[PDB]
């Protein structure tokens, strides 16, 4: 069972740093090629680093050469990558990846397992909480009820409904950025005999700030 | 940096359809890998080397392709392979990405159930006023919703955005927000959330008045 757990992501200023860890289990580390891939938020694959068995060799493109840096150590299965100089276009999802076995005899280039990622965030703007606001309806078998979640900075929040206990019938939409600040809603149908006879409560969360938020929808 | 150009940007097919994608290249390349990738998943390889398909993948993948033009075929599709396909080559430094085939399951047609909200006392209180619009479960993807106060279209402060394809029904969502000023908000009646869709003749509209 191949198992690649990375960690480290987190929001950074323009020309800040961090650094990534991977923990590696499950295959003989040491010999395989390893590597840096990163998802970027329009959905982009990138390579941003690769380095060999031993920490001998090492490749980056030229966007990232001198700004990053890869590393390894075999006696802890880890992989590591240092990034600096972070730049607005560094913000993605990084994964950490498996590349060749060292005796192919025939590189592929392929990566063959992938790490769920950690994710990073370079910018400036300033970390803001969300405020929470309640959706009903002005005035069916079924009603549509929501949450909007507005104002803040950076991803990710977390909404759940009756603290998990509604479950189906949720929509929880991707955030959209506008001038450095996220917006993001969530709605939740539920039968018109369960509200407003009934609380019906949306949960935020915003690691980020702290904050959490549990807002009841009130009729009117 | 290679380019590769994967079409379609996004495709939709029936289960037990065949399915054919490309990815073409700027300049020669020699060997082409594919990956897939899921919401909820990190990308799995699926062909390397262009036609040779990577541990546990079934058959019904196959992949061919040389020069400028490569190609990801699924025989008979199932259900399972909602994804984006993503192709990169390995000819040049650096290995390089297409920027994905988001391949989409198709159902039947369904009608948005439509629900509109005026702003919270909560965020007035603070000096501002956010209108929010659910369009709920409705297919196929592409939808329209207008804005209207007062009776007059308003297109500047709105944010969209749609949910991935359901796992479940296989439909898709949107939400619309036109944020105002409270000063504005306070300032008219009628609200209008106006939604128009292969499914509708005209449009599907809601509405509240700010005095009701
Ligand atoms: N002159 C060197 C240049 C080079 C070194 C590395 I270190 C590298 O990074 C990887 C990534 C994966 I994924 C692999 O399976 C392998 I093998 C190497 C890459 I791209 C290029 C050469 O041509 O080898």
């Known amino acids: 069972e191949v198992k690649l757990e990375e960690s480290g992501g987190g929001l950074v200023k323009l020309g800040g740093s961090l650094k990534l860890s991977c923990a590696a289990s499950?295959?003989?580390?040491?010999?395989?090629?390893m590597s840096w891939v990163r998802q970027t938020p329009e959905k982009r694959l990138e390579l941003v680093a690769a380095?060999?068995?031993?920490?001998?060799?090492?490749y980056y493109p030229d966007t990232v050469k001198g700004r990053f840096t890869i590393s390894r150590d075999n006696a802890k299965n880890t992989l590591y990558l240092q990034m600096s100089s972070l730049k607005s276009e560094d913000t993605a999802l990084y994964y950490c990846?498996?590349?060749?076995?060292?005796?192919?005899?025939?590189?592929?280039?392929?990566?063959?397992?992938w790490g769920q990622g950690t994710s990073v965030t370079v910018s400036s703007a300033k970390t803001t909480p969300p405020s929470v606001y309640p959706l009903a309806p002005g005035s069916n078998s079924m009603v549509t009820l929501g949450c909007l979640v507005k104002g803040y900075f950076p991803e990710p929040v977390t909404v759940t409904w009756n603290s998990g206990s509604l479950s189906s019938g949720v929509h929880t939409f991707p955030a959209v950025l506008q001038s450095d600040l996220y917006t993001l809603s969530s709605s939740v149908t539920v039968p018109s005999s369960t509200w407003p006879s009934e609380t019906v409560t949306c949960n935020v969360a915003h690691p980020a700030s702290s904050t959490k938020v549990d807002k009841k929808i009130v009729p009117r | 940096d290679i380019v590769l150009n994967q079409s379609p940007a996004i495709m939709s097919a029936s289960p037990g359809e065949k399915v054919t994608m490309t990815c073409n290249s700027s300049?020669?390349?020699?060997?082409m890998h594919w990956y897939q990738h899921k919401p909820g998943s990190s990308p799995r390889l699926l062909i390397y080397?262009?036609?040779n398909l990577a541990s546990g993948v079934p058959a019904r993948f196959s992949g061919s392709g040389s020069g400028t033009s490569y190609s990801l075929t699924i025989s008979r599709m199932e259900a399972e392979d909602a994804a984006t396909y993503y192709c990169?080559?390995?000819?040049?430094?650096?290995?390089?990405f297409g920027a994905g085939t988001k391949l989409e399951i198709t159902r039947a047609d369904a009608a948005p159930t439509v629900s509109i909200f005026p702003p919270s006392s909560e965020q007035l209180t603070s000096g501002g006023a956010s209108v929010v619009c659910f369009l709920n479960n409705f297919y196929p993807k592409d939808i329209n919703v207008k804005w209207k106060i007062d009776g007059s279209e308003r297109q500047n402060g709105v944010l969209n955005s749609w949910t991935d394809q359901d796992s479940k029904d296989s439909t898709y969502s949107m939400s619309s927000t036109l944020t105002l000023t409270k000063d504005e908000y306070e300032r008219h009646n009628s609200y209008t959330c106006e939604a128009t869709h292969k499914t509708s003749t005209s449009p599907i509209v809601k509405s509240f008045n700010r005095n009701e």
């Open positions: 990846a498996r590349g060749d076995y060292y005796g192919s005899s025939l590189y592929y280039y392929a990566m063959d397992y």
């Open positions: 499950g295959f003989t580390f040491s010999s395989y090629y």
């Open positions: 380095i060999n068995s031993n920490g001998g060799s090492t």
């Open positions: 300049s020669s390349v020699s060997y």
């Open positions: 080397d262009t036609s």
């Open positions: 990169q080559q390995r000819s040049s430094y650096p290995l390089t």
